[PDB]
Amino acid sequence: RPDFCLEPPYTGPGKARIIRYFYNAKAGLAQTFVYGGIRAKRNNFKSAEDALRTCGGA
Secondary structure (H helix, E strand, O other): OOHHHHOOOOOOOOOOOEEEEEEEOOOOEEEEEEEOOOOOOOOOEOOHHHHHHHHOOO
16 A cells, blocks of 8 residues: 555645545545645545545555
């Protein structure tokens, strides 16, 4: 699994409030979180399906 998949979601320093997805490795599912609009970490997807294709495991 890529190493970023187990990291907590990162809102970042931006003031926006955009709904993104992170892979929740303990649930084995994607979950939504509020993203501030700049300086994303890599556990940050536009869709559940992208989070699972990247992070869901072989």
